Amino acid sequence: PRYELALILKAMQRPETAATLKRTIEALMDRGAIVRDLENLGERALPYRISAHSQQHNRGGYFLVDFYAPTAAVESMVEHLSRDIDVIRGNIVKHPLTQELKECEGIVPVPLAEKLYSTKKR
């Protein structure tokens, strides 16, 4: 089914971060994936000092790889993201636009419960 790949990279200079933005996508169609879209969320400041393989980071560029893939490709990508040296943290979430919303009609005011205790003299 269809997944987003919330993927943070390390801040590396558009000739040399498009080098590694390929090698994720090649690791999708080598796991059989059909890459739908790619987006950039920007190169923002990291919410906390992530230290991952093996050094300390404070800036980070945010991307998104929307793709379809089989079942077996998802637990095999997280291997390929783990041994990667240029990514920060890539986690393959299913696309929230597979599950269609329920029609939330609005809240209803719940009463106090009735018949909770007996009608005793007390």
Binding site: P111, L112, E114, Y117, T119
Partner: protein
């Protein structure tokens, strides 16, 4: 002789309906030093304050404008098997006539 079900249809309490924030005129029927008792019709009375704008214009019989919030003032509480009326209305005063 007119049938009850007919004269309920032609009855200005029935014509009003859901009484939220509805302009009603009412008679004052008892003055206490600060608190005004306005009989608009209805089942009950209501109690208001004496404002600082035209504070001497409120005598017995003074027709007064009322927003008439919600004739209830009843609420069921956590143990109760009926609900606690206060025999009031919480209608807020506006003016005179």
């Amino acid at each position: 002789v007119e049938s009850f079900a007919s004269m309920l249809r032609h009855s200005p309490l029935t014509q009003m309906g859901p009484a939220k924030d509805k302009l009603v005129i009412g008679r004052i029927f008892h003055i206490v030093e600060n608190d005004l008792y306005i009989d608009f019709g209805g089942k009950f009375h209501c109690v208001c304050r004496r404002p600082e704008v035209d504070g001497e214009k409120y005598q017995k019989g003074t027709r007064v404008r009322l927003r008439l919030l919600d004739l209830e003032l009843t609420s069921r509480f956590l143990g109760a098997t009926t609900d606690t009326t206060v025999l009031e209305a919480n209608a807020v005063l506006l003016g005179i006539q």
